[PDB]
Design a binder for this molecule. Sequence first.
Ligand SMILES: OC[C@H]1O[C@@H](O)[C@H](O)[C@@H](O)[C@H]1O
Ligand SMILES: [Ca+2]
Ligand code: NA
Length: 307
Amino acid sequence: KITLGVTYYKFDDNFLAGMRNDMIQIAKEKYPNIELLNNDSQNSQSILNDQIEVLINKGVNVLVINLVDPTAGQSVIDKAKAANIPIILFNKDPGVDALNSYDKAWYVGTTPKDSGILQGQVIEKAWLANPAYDLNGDGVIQYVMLFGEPGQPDAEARTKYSIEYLNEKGIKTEELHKDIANWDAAQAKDKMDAWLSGPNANKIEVVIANNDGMALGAVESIKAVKKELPVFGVDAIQEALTLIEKGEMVGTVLQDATGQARAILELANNIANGKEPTEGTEWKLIDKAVRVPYVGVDKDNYKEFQK
Ligand SMILES: OC[C@H]1O[C@@H](O)[C@H](O)[C@@H](O)[C@H]1O
Ligand SMILES: [Ca+2]
Ligand code: NA
């Protein structure tokens, strides 16, 4: 058999929970010779470090690692190298220097700039179609920004490029608030409650979140005070598609969890068997990474992605 030691920074992360289910299913359906050892790092890099050691000692064929601390890539790769076991990092990108430090390191993820641009496009379309969104009539989008995880490039890229896209198309924006909620619905709900209970809550026209999980929390907060505000996320998790169906979210951006899970399995299968990681697959490694594209989602196409 081939054994993959797979770690997830925490099990309640919505997007990664979907990917974990996908990987389990694909492995069962297509790879009878692969065994998955799944690990929950409890949002602790120290727990992850110990888990990596356990998996090394158990002699897994490939380490498949999701960083807890998004800056800890070099240390994790160093452990794999010292153990002489190949490593595929996923979802939290350790950067090129770290990947280049080990001949048996690879990465599967995305180019989050592209998701920021798509989110901007989704917002632009909805904004233009709904003049009522512009509550103060100034032509400017007064927004709040729910930022994900500091140091995880998906967060800064979605924050930067969504707004830059809008401005590039001649749509003025004004940031009323921006705060960190770490991909988490409950944290986002708390932040949104603070914003909606503030003296100037009325100024908010658009809610932008770096992921769907935080958008879910924002929606709970908005519903409680009986307001109607357009909310945008990223991932197209099923819960968000349902909110779009219900008219409680306006848009998101599909992040392809199934494709990422498939890439991890296909690359790991090759790596474990002395084959070039992309052999017999659709994937291209650019600077040792697979970058799986995103898709913009709104009321007009969300049905295509429901399961
Ligand atoms: O690093 C974990 C995060 O990764 C992002 O790509 C995703 O949009 C978030 O929902 C969360 O899963
Ligand atoms: Ca306005
Ligand atoms: Na992990």
